[PDB]
Amino acid sequence: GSSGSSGRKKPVSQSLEFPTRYSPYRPYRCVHQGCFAAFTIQQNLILHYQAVHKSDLPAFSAEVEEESGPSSG
Numbered sequence: 338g339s340s341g342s343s344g345r346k347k348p349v350s351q352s353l354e355f356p357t358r359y360s361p362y363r364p365y366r367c368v369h370q371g372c373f374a375a376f377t378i379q380q381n382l383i384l385h386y387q388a389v390h391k392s393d394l395p396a397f398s399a400e401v402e403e404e405s406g407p408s409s410g
């Protein structure tokens with residue numbers, strides 16, 4: 338006897354969402370009194386402390402995963 342089979346898989350078109358290749362303002366700014374550095378991404382900001390002051394960011398919070406932020410108005 339004899340027989341065959343078919344198979345395939347189309348790729349995925351992964352696009353970007355970033356608004357601008359680079360942001361002018363940065364919400365994250367080193368607290369260290371005397372450090373002119375900042376990183377848009379919270380992550381890229383972590384290493385900065387380990388690359389400059391070879392340390393990790395401070396602690397100003399506790400085991401909490403809530404928002405309860407001041408909604409508009």
Ligand SMILES: [Zn+2]
Nearest residue numbers: 367369372389
């Ligand atoms: Zn710093």
